[PDB]
Amino acid sequence: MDPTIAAGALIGGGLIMAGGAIGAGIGDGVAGNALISGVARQPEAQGRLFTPFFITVGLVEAAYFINLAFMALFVFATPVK
Amino acid sequence: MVVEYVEEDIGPRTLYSFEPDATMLFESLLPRYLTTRVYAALLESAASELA
Numbered sequence: 001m002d003p004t005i006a007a008g009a010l011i012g013g014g015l016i017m018a019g020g021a022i023g024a025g026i027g028d029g030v031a032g033n034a035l036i037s038g039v040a041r042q043p044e045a046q047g048r049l050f051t052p053f054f055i056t057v058g059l060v061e062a063a064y065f066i067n068l069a070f071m072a073l074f075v076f077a078t079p080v081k
Numbered sequence: 082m083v084v085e086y087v088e089e090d091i092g093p094r095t096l097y098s099f100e101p102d103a104t105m106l107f108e109s110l111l112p113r114y115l116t117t118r119v120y121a122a123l124l125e126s127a128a129s130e131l132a
């Protein structure tokens with residue numbers, strides 16, 4: 001009963017965190033690529049390029065955080081017990 | 082023409098975008114510059130002839 005459910009919960013939490021980290025890492029990488037390029041072309045534009053950047057990042061990290069939450073729900077408060 | 086280097090003049094500045102790239106526009110502008118100089122020479126010679 002409990003052992004295989006806990007094993008499935010651990011594997012599911014691992015999948016959730018893996019997907020979240022892949023998505024967050026690559027999304028941050030692409031957005032920061034855009035930011036570094038825009039600052040390398042126009043240094044004085046660093047101040048005005050942080051408002052779209054932090055919008056994008058704000059969405060990206062959101063996904064990460066949500067996945068984090070569910071990871072906890074899978075490993076600390078297993079929804080099927 | 083002779084390539085003459087003046088100086089960096091302004092220090093770090095904004096990067097200029099070129100469509101499609103710098104070499105195409107340069108080779109499109111070179112004969113236009115020749116023609117502009119020929120035209121300026123013609124105008125100067127006309128004013129000189131009148132004087």
Ligand SMILES: COc1nc2ccc(Br)cc2cc1[C@@H](c1ccccc1)[C@@](O)(CCN(C)C)c1cccc2ccccc12
Pocket residue numbers: 059062063066
């Ligand atoms: C941009 O936000 C959206 N746009 C949508 C567009 C279309 C549709 Br049909 C659904 C949309 C839903 C949303 C959010 C939302 C807001 C309120 C309630 C439910 C869903 C979201 O799903 C975004 C998740 N992203 C950003 C990873 C979300 C879910 C869960 C927790 C969140 C916590 C914080 C912020 C957003 C949270």
